[PDB]
Each structure stands twice: as C-alpha cells, then as structure tokens.
C-alpha cells in the first residue's frame, strides 16, 4: 500500500525536527537528492557503505539516533555534512525498523557496541536485494519531501 509516503512523512518529521541548524537541513536535502539515485545505479550495499562512512558513527551521534527513535526532541550534533549523512542513515534504519525488515531490538544493541554493528552490516548484506526493491518509493518520497519543505541553500 501507499503507506510508505506516510512513513516518509513520519521520518521526515523526526529528521526535520532533529536538525536544529538550517545548514544541517539543507545538507540533508542534498543527501536526499543524491543518495536515492546512487542506490538506483550502484546498488544498496555500496551506497550504504558510502553513507555509514560519511556519518562517522562514533559513540555519541549513535545515541542521538537511538534517542531520535523515541524522543521527538532529540537533536543531531556535528558538522552539517556529518549530521546530514547521519540523518539519512536514520531515514534508512527507520524504514528498516517500521517495515520490520530487522527487529528494532537487534538494531538497538548494534548501535551500542561496534561488536554487533558489524553484525548489523552483515545482516543488511543478507537482505540487500529485498531492501533495494522495497525502499525505492520511500526514498523517492523522502527526496520529494526534502525538495518541497527545506529551502534550497
């Protein structure tokens, strides 16, 4: 069903609220325009490696994400690009949780260890041809929402 546009509205709400600096918002808009086309061309797992490389999931931005799951007032801190990539990674993980592709219980004890985070990436590798076909319209909606709401810098 079209409830993926609804899911995109929810995710974009959480992100648009957790990016306090407008520079972070515009940077997320750029990430949104780019990464969906890159998932189309180069496939999911390559683009996911690219994204988690530039999100710099140290230990602190990680907890901001786990909180952004729950607390509607959690914020993302860091560089404009460093938080835009982490916001897009949150978009991805949000979709993966809601559509129950991977249990949020698992995804939580992964974002806290660096010792089950690699197992998170392995799991996402076992599911890349599924995710690649699912997230298409959801990320297209996220991109449309970002071009619609956030000001072009």
């Amino acid at each position: 069903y079209e409830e993926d546009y609804k899911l995109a509205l929810e995710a974009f709400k959480k992100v648009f609220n957790a990016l306090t600096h407008y520079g972070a918002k515009q940077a997320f808009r750029s990430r949104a325009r780019d990464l969906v086309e890159e998932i189309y061309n180069s496939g999911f797992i390559p683009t996911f490696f690219y994204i988690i490389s530039k999100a710099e999931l140290n230990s602190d931005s990680l907890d901001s994400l786990i909180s952004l799951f729950s607390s509607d007032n959690a914020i993302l801190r860091g560089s404009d690009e460093n938080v835009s990539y982490s916001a897009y990674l949150f978009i991805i993980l949000y979709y993966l949780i809601k559509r129950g592709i991977i249990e949020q219980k698992f995804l939580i004890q992964a974002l806290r260890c660096e010792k089950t985070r690699l197992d998170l990436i392995d799991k996402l590798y076992n599911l890349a041809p599924i995710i690649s076909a699912k997230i298409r319209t959801y990320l297209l909606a996220i991109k449309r929402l970002s071009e619609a709401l956030i000001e072009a810098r």
Partner: protein
Amino acid sequence: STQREYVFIPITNSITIDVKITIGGSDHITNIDERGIHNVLVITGYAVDEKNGRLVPTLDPCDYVKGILVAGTPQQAQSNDFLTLKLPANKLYLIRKKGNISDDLKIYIPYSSPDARNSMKTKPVSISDDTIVNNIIKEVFDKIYNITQKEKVKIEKVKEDIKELFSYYALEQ
C-alpha cells in the same frame, strides 16, 4: 577503589538526597565545562518508575536510562536493595568523553525489586516543561556540583542539554 555513585534524572521528587556526602572528595567525572554535561553514563536494559525512582532491572535492550555518576556512597543507609560493583571504568557507556578515566570504580545503583508481582510493561517518556529541569538543577545540581550558578554563567546551554540529552523508560505500575 575510588567510589562513584549513580543517580539519574527523574521527574518525581525522589531526587534530592541519594548520597549522604555531596562530593566526599575533590574529584568527579561528570564534568560541566560550558559544553553541557560531559560523560553522561547510560545504562540500557533498566527502566525507572519515578515513584521511589529507581532502575528496575529489565532485560529489554531498548529500555535505557542515563544519569549522573557522582562520587559518593549509598550513605550506608540504602544497601539492601542495591548491588555493588567493581568495574574497569571503561565497561561504561560514557557520552562526550573528554579524557582518561580511573579504570577502577565502585558504583551503587538505585535498584528496585524485579517486580515479580506484575508484568513489567515499559513506558517511554521524554523531558519538557523547562521548569521540570530547572527545579531539578535545584534539587541535585546544587547539592552535587557547586560549579552551577557559581562558575557557570551560561547555564541555559546546560538547560537545553538536559532537555535534549535525557529520556528514559518507566512502567506506570
């Protein structure tokens, strides 16, 4: 082993007195350096029912509570329902780490019963109503860190940081 005592950010007024000494020394790890609350220890898997606010030992990983790690003891008054611990002080989950750590520690956790009389259905909650954080900067953050309102001139940053950096799980039982 140098003892650092644990206590979190509740919303029920079970906050004020949870260690007989305030500092008991001149050391601390939970800094405040005009850059918010450094080194906020998080402990996932334990939920807090603020009515006599204490971590309930859960096994749900998503149920997290993150509070201060003061340097103190259980006052030698609440030692039955507590569980001691000596740990290498890196088995923690600190946040915004600024330096090295003792790597030797004794903490005592506000610890409620396993609640075998009911199913521990968990409730998530966040923090708003900025007076909810102001009155608890009063309730503990005066009687713990005298550097508040005496050395901090930009405390509004710590206000928004306690507001954004703190959320937790309850049971409403």
